[PDB]
Amino acid sequence: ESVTANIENVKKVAHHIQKLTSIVPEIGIICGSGLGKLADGVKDKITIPYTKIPNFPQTSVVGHSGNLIFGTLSGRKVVVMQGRFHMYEGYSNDTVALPIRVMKLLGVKILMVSNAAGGLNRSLKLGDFVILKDHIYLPGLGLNNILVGPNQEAFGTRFPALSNAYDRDLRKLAVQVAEENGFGNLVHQGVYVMNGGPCYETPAECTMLLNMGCDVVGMSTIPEVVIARHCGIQVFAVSLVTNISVLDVESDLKPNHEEVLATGAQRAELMQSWFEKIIEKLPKD
Amino acid sequence: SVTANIENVKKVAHHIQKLTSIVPEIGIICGSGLGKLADGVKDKITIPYTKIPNFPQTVVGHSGNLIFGTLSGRKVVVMQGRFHMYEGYSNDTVALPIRVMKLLGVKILMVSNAAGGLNRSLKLGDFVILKDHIYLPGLGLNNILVGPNQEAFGTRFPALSNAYDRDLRKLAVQVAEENGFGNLVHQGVYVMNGGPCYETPAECTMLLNMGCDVVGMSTIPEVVIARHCGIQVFAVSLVTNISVLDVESAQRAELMQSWFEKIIEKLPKD
Amino acid sequence: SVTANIENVKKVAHHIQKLTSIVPEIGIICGSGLGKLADGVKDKITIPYTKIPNFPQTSHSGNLIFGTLSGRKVVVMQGRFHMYEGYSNDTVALPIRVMKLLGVKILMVSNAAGGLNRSLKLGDFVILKDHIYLPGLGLNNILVGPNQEAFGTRFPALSNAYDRDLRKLAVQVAEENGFGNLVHQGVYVMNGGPCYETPAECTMLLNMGCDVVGMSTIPEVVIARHCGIQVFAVSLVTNISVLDVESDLKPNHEEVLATGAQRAELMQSWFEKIIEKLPKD
Ligand SMILES: O=P(O)(O)O[C@H]1O[C@H](CO)[C@@H](O)[C@H]1O
Ligand SMILES: O=P(O)(O)O[C@H]1O[C@H](CO)[C@@H](O)[C@H]1O
Ligand SMILES: O=P(O)(O)O[C@H]1O[C@H](CO)[C@@H](O)[C@H]1O
């Protein structure tokens, strides 16, 4: 279970991190599969390997520790999680919750998150951006909600509302920023459903998910968003459609993480630009 | 906690039987903000969970109580302090109290909860008698019964036919109508959201389209255990919120306690 | 329980290889009341799970049965591992990965399922052509945890999980042997169980596009697919799902077993005739 994402352990982590950077992040960023470029476009960046943060959850790419990247992006102080924690890997809820709660204590007000997702909605094209305006947390509706277990009152209430989980204003900004910069056509809003994974969704599953009103499906993001909303961090989340969900069993096309990565590699640049440009126009600061 | 097997349950029940001579025929579980009923129990014996060895324990200030006594002439055991899965309680922990009830002699379990209203015909404060449920966690491999079956209590694969006893439902409705609040009472399908997050509009829309009428984070697990060991079940949701479907878009507590008393009043007796 | 990693799976496969010379190319898993196939295995060696170190235990003890079925080398799991029993992912995964290491190329699985699809009759066979892994979607996918690279990829696709050629072959065999009318193809949804499905659940599952519902199969199929074993799977419809909450009709396990046992011989025949027509090099 790693370390309990309670106030004491989170504070310890936050304070260790604070000793390692003068950057007080206003904006937290989680990069999805193949969506790292943004990470590297951080200016005046301090890079802190997860291995170098005591009690911070560990995730390697393959042997390599993920990184916490502090710096600025469009003149805003950010912390970027380079390497997220997917539940299908077996990570505990505390493992996934901790980094977000650390972000909260560090000063993060807005969490921006990307993921690679399958396009269920038939109108989606590979490489489309689907801003999450809502989600369906299949694991959470089951008994696998990241918040299951004693509530950490320090961070939030027992029964978080997920009413405006995907801040409608952030979404409006994101869309406008896409519109103004010539790629509004790539931008949709929709419902992301979490498949715990790690299997890609069968055609029957995709068909069911689509009929449930899901637009994109992936294996991440919702738990982080839940933790985020729980502790009052505003969320903006986008899915890169990295595969068009196959709805027919009588089909050649088979999802594969490689093509997901390829699609991510191809759209990483535009998504980075989009993110930098959204960040530039974030209010309150 | 401790496996809700016949031996561990037998022990907790035997302890309790040393603490009271009330043999309940009716078990009552009150939901969120309900349970203004535990007050109206006559000649009650309040037994704090803390006092019972191996009994699951509730949650600052308000520790749990097993309230024994009489309601509308009938012997009851009320659970003041309910155990929700989102709290991280084990299957055994949630099953044990229900099986203890069984050993203590409970024949009918009456359950109330606070639920979100999915069905668009529902209004705040409506009562939705459960006539069926969708056990999302159960289908998704978090069925309270997962693990070695405790054969002493019930069969490996319990059917959930008539799980919400139709006769009890008929009676509950008749009593509501006879008491001038029949118009508040609906019947419908309760779906369990493991929680503890409230349901997103997308989730509610999906739940509605799944044929769900109300959603909450309790009840089904207890009901499963009750049905498993042959306890008849009556269960009702107080609609305490009307679910929002699109992102782009005390009074009752005592009425319910009254309703329960009046139902119990009319419950058949051997 | 031991991790279904390559080391543990090898150890088991080797210990089994010390007890039998039969290199199985076909793995068979029998469902509720359907183990009549285990009897038809010729030149057979029966290896109680108990006789296998670190092999999952289930019950009399379960058996790995090695031998010949329609001239093809098979290994049959007499006694499978159901998640509703409390078994770990590793417990379910390991036997399938052991089969992989023993040389299994095709996994044929049966199960007893509730018939959701309203055109299904009791005792029908519904060949699985796809599945809805409700536990899987809900974060109880058997593969959750470190990926075992020796066996498979981190994110297995499940597109042709129910090998369409095996399905075609299964249907032709049924058709030519007089019981094609018994045979359907459909979507199996896993109810984690062990409760039978409520009428509202059944109604929901049906509307989700599910034809049959059971509490097994998907996890082994997923592990099989993950390690590149080809899968054929069939639900025996051992009960017609009750969608009506006012109905007196209800599932009864004794009836489920009876219905399965009644059909086991035909199913055995079918599996044998399928295996007989499997292409061989
Ligand atoms: O969600 P992200 O991290 O982007 O990654 C997604 O893509 C991967 C498989 O394609 C899974 O990890 C899924 O969750
Ligand atoms: O179901 P009861 O016990 O009514 O409580 C319900 O209300 C709480 C949330 O408002 C959750 O615990 C939910 O299950
Ligand atoms: O799937 P098989 O193994 O056939 O068995 C099924 O039959 C039982 C339910 O009747 C459960 O065990 C279910 O999994």
Short mmCIF file of C-alpha atoms and ligand atoms in Angstrom, two decimals, chain B residues 157, chain C residues 30-32 34 80 82 84 110-113 188 196 214-217 238-239 253 256, ligand 3:
data_model
loop_
_atom_site.label_atom_id
_atom_site.label_comp_id
_atom_site.label_asym_id
_atom_site.label_seq_id
_atom_site.Cartn_x
_atom_site.Cartn_y
_atom_site.Cartn_z
CA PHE B 157 -24.68 -19.61 -4.95
CA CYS C 30 -14.53 -28.14 -17.67
CA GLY C 31 -17.38 -26.04 -16.28
CA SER C 32 -20.05 -26.82 -13.64
CA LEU C 34 -19.40 -30.69 -17.39
CA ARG C 80 -11.20 -24.88 -11.89
CA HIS C 82 -13.44 -19.34 -9.40
CA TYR C 84 -15.87 -15.87 -6.00
CA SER C 110 -16.74 -24.66 -20.91
CA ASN C 111 -18.86 -23.11 -18.25
CA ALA C 112 -22.41 -23.10 -17.01
CA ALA C 113 -24.07 -19.76 -17.71
CA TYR C 188 -20.44 -13.80 -22.07
CA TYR C 196 -26.91 -15.48 -9.05
CA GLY C 214 -21.42 -16.67 -15.51
CA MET C 215 -18.80 -16.31 -12.85
CA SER C 216 -15.76 -17.77 -14.55
CA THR C 217 -13.94 -18.14 -17.80
CA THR C 238 -27.76 -24.13 -17.49
CA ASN C 239 -30.54 -21.74 -16.55
CA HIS C 253 -27.52 -24.42 -8.35
CA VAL C 256 -27.67 -25.77 -12.87
O1 LIG D 3 -18.40 -21.47 -14.74
P1 LIG D 3 -18.49 -22.69 -14.24
O2 LIG D 3 -17.28 -23.17 -13.85
O3 LIG D 3 -19.03 -23.45 -15.14
O4 LIG D 3 -19.39 -22.65 -13.16
C1 LIG D 3 -20.48 -21.76 -12.99
O5 LIG D 3 -21.48 -22.39 -12.25
C2 LIG D 3 -21.61 -21.83 -10.99
C3 LIG D 3 -22.94 -21.11 -10.86
O6 LIG D 3 -24.04 -21.93 -11.04
C4 LIG D 3 -20.43 -20.91 -10.82
O7 LIG D 3 -19.36 -21.63 -10.41
C5 LIG D 3 -20.18 -20.49 -12.22
O8 LIG D 3 -18.86 -20.11 -12.40
#
